[PDB]
Design an enzyme around this catalytic site. Sequence first.
Site, mmCIF file in Angstrom:
data_model
loop_
_atom_site.group_PDB
_atom_site.id
_atom_site.type_symbol
_atom_site.label_atom_id
_atom_site.label_comp_id
_atom_site.label_asym_id
_atom_site.label_seq_id
_atom_site.Cartn_x
_atom_site.Cartn_y
_atom_site.Cartn_z
ATOM 1 N N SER A 1 10.130 6.187 9.683
ATOM 2 C CA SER A 1 10.986 5.638 8.640
ATOM 3 C C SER A 1 12.441 5.489 9.081
ATOM 4 C CB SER A 1 10.924 6.532 7.404
ATOM 5 O OG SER A 1 9.884 6.102 6.576
HETATM 6 C C1 LIG Z 1 8.742 6.903 6.648
HETATM 7 O O1 LIG Z 1 8.340 7.263 7.702
HETATM 8 C C2 LIG Z 1 8.014 7.317 5.383
HETATM 9 N N1 LIG Z 1 6.800 7.989 5.780
HETATM 10 C C3 LIG Z 1 5.534 7.561 5.215
HETATM 11 O O2 LIG Z 1 5.516 6.679 4.425
HETATM 12 C C4 LIG Z 1 4.228 8.235 5.627
HETATM 13 C C5 LIG Z 1 4.170 9.677 5.132
HETATM 14 C C6 LIG Z 1 3.543 10.645 5.902
HETATM 15 C C7 LIG Z 1 3.486 11.954 5.454
HETATM 16 C C8 LIG Z 1 4.056 12.300 4.241
HETATM 17 C C9 LIG Z 1 4.681 11.331 3.474
HETATM 18 C C10 LIG Z 1 4.738 10.020 3.917
HETATM 19 C C11 LIG Z 1 8.960 8.214 4.531
HETATM 20 N N2 LIG Z 1 10.020 9.060 5.555
HETATM 21 C C12 LIG Z 1 9.723 10.502 5.404
HETATM 22 C C13 LIG Z 1 10.911 11.264 5.535
HETATM 23 O O3 LIG Z 1 12.032 10.690 5.488
HETATM 24 O O4 LIG Z 1 10.843 12.511 5.710
HETATM 25 C C14 LIG Z 1 9.078 10.625 3.900
HETATM 26 C C15 LIG Z 1 8.146 11.829 3.808
HETATM 27 C C16 LIG Z 1 10.174 10.698 2.838
HETATM 28 S S1 LIG Z 1 8.208 9.199 3.741
#
Ligand SMILES: *C(=O)[C@@H](NC(=O)Cc1ccccc1)[C@@H]1N[C@@H](C(=O)O)C(C)(C)S1
Length: 640
Positions: A384
């Site tokens: 992300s």
């Molecule tokens: C970006 O990578 C997002 N991740 C996902 O959509 C997949 C995912 C995997 C495991 C748990 C939840 C979501 C978001 N970026 C992270 C972060 O910033 O820590 C989130 C958990 C907020 S989702």
Amino acid sequence: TQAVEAGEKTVEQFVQALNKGDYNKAAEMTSKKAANKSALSEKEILDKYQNIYGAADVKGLQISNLKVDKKDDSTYSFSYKAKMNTSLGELKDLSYKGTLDRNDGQTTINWQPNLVFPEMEGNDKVSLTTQEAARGNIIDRNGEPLATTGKLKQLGVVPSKLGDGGEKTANIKAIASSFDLTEDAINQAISQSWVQPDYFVPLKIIDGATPELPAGATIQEVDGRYYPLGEAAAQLIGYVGDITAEDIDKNPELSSNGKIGRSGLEMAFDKDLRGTTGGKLSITDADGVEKKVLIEHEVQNGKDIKLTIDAKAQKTAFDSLGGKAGSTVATTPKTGDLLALASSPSYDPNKMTNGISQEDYKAYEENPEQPFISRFATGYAPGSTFKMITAAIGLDNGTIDPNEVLTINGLKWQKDSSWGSYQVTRVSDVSQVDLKTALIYSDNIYTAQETLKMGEKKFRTGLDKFIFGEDLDLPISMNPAQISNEDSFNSDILLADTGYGQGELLINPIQQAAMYSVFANNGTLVYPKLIADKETKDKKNVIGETAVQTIVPDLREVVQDVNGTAHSLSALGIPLAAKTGTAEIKEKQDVKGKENSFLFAFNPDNQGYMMVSMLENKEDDDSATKRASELLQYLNQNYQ
Ligand SMILES: *C(=O)[C@@H](NC(=O)Cc1ccccc1)[C@@H]1N[C@@H](C(=O)O)C(C)(C)S1
């Protein structure tokens, strides 16, 4: 003249047989032993070449300027210039003369000892004396040592002064307890085939203070390569091992007695660190008095190498990973100076370069977390964290309105029914989402919709202005980052996944730090730099200044807002701009898939430091943000 060509072919075959190292094949091209023909028999010539060329480590005999003409009815004079490589460098412009003999239907060489070296008479001998070069040091940006040659305290035992069967077991258990050594290993060491009763059998290196020595134990001072940071820099620095005969056969200028870099910078900078071997290669009379000197130069110790690394930052970054799988990159983003390159878990390079047990080495190799991997140089899906690059692209080409509010209902979304069972997923069910809200909550659905809105053509146009496909001028082995496998996505799903850093993207942490440096230089990408003296190289106008001035305040809110994904860093009370990420990886190995945690953070007030940390195959309730406090405090204090 049809025989002059045969003599030419004979001299060529002889030089080739010498070059390939087959001295028997070269000796069999010589005429019979005589005073008008060859000076020695074939076996004598073979032993002469084998002994002398092996003593000088001769490799790569190349001839040039060949000329061969007739001299008598059966004699044919030949001559050429020669170049060859020895333990002391290159022998250039060697003038070789000789004669050939044509007989029946074959042309052979009237061999003479001047066909070994040009000035050799009857029974002249060859001497080679060498002085080994000292290996250069690897030092950090402030002169602190990362790899030096130190005086280590070797611990060992003499099996004779140990016992007689009763007191032997007592002293073995005493030396095994007072030094954290397996009592079975001490006997395994004093029971090897090479050991004899009066010998000193080394066991381990003592790190610092020497405890009380029980009976039989003795401490000997031994000089060798030493790594002060140890595991904290093992992947980056590397280690050195004993030079083997195969190493010498590949490169004669290695000291057949010294150490060669086996991994990391020690191997990447092996030439500049090992120096040049000094000595003298000379021909002598049969009595032993010197005739002429073929080669002579004096020793050149290896030059030191200064890195941009900060030793304190390197140790802090490594220790913050708690031995879990992960990596951390810390830079000064305005110059690219790599302050820290940590990878975890790690191996002991000191016990690796001294004496490493083969079960210990097999433990390193069989460890599932793989401590030998340079994780700062391994490609990953950036997660992300990659949103802020997609958003910057969307701001440049005008696709994204920073204040336009998308209406998202639920935690799953798809473009249309053709996607099947697949849906982009977010964690927070926020109904009214604009850019700032999407960055705060890390909203994949917003990012996926904006990526599909701008389209593949505009998306790749913005991506191509970065460093995808480039090889950074770094002495670290790595692959160039890639957007996808091919030059086209050919999938709306893959386009959206790439939009929030989750498609076929492969970017290593160093390449991530380079790409993310745009937010600390108003859209200018600053290439990372590891050698302290190299000049800063950059790449202007990667993204617009407007996009930076729009996103960086939102990245502040990722920390300061009460619902921001990096809100725990607000406890630091320092100016922070951050972005977190959690990538999902399907690793066929055990129950379901694993996930990686990512953190990007830098000082948006002075642009003095930038940090990219990751946890690979993370444990539950673990994250890179959870561990970043200490390194961020240090970088904020010491790098304004
Ligand atoms: C970006 O990578 C997002 N991740 C996902 O959509 C997949 C995912 C995997 C495991 C748990 C939840 C979501 C978001 N970026 C992270 C972060 O910033 O820590 C989130 C958990 C907020 S989702």
